[PDB]
Design a protein around this ligand. Structure first.
Ligand SMILES: [Hg+2]
Ligand SMILES: [Hg+2]
Ligand SMILES: [Hg+2]
Ligand SMILES: [Hg+2]
Ligand SMILES: [Hg+2]
Ligand SMILES: [Hg+2]
Ligand SMILES: [Hg+2]
Ligand SMILES: [Hg+2]
Lengths: 153, 153
């Protein structure tokens, strides 16, 4: 096995998470399929879409009917494509992902698993501090910005 | 103006409606963008995606921030593509669509509008009634099905 990954997949998944967080106000886990082409050993994950599910005791159940109906409904436009595996959002792999993985493992034999962590802290954005300094090179004179080093409480 | 339409758009929109009806149990209106290429005057609606909104007094408000952030986030993969117009589900055009259209009209100059009616009655599925008849043609004999005409209460 060896894997390629279009950036559209990663954007698709972020967008799914963002659309969902908005729906409730709080961020929730999202789940979906990985599709694409699989030539030679070049597994090319070309795209993705959303998968329905339902959560109960922190256990997630994939809606199989929804998947097969979509596959049915989309077989003509996804003819050159294949189901490669599934994705979800969050941190390092958890027991719950294995539980979901076994269900995807019932759809295709050895499914890929893509996990994306949409968690970002604002405090990680670049922050530069400057002080103003009036420079006069022999001849030309001006005000410039001179960078300062800073600590964080 | 003159327009082309990939079947992926129509499938995409059905799917959005279906994923949403599932979320609540009851079917709700869905809303999203139409993208693609626009060569000559051959407007080719190549694809679509979902748009956030919020509903109050039967009035729908497009989340502009969500749209521009997606466009920002997707500009690299949607570079050969353009925003062509918007879609929603339901019957013939209503005042509410005009209200939403004016907001899409603020994003691009002369936006297209695609409406899709996901309403289907079960009673419209084909139903054939047959009677059995045992035929013995000179030589060969068999049982076949012979169609009957039927009324509907
Ligand atoms: Hg979802
Ligand atoms: Hg497929
Ligand atoms: Hg399995
Ligand atoms: Hg497996
Ligand atoms: Hg939506
Ligand atoms: Hg675009
Ligand atoms: Hg306008
Ligand atoms: Hg307009």
């Amino acid at each position: 096995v060896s894997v390629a990954l279009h950036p559209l997949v990663i954007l698709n998944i972020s967008d799914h998470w963002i659309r969902m967080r908005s729906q409730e106000g709080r961020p929730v886990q999202v789940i979906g399929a990985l599709i694409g082409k699989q030539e030679g050993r070049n597994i090319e994950v070309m795209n993705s879409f959303e998968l329905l599910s339902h959560t109960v005791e922190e256990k997630i159940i994939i809606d199989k009917e929804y998947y097969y109906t979509k596959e049915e409904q989309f077989k003509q436009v996804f003819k050159e494509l294949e189901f490669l595996g599934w994705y979800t959002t969050g941190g390092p792999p958890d027991p719950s992902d294995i539980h979901v993985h076994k269900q995807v493992c019932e759809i295709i034999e050895s499914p890929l698993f893509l996990k994306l962590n949409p968690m970002t802290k604002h405090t990680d954005l670049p922050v530069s501090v400057f002080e103003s300094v009036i420079d006069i090179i022999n001849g030309e004179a001006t005000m410039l910005f001179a960078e300062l080093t800073y600590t964080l409480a």
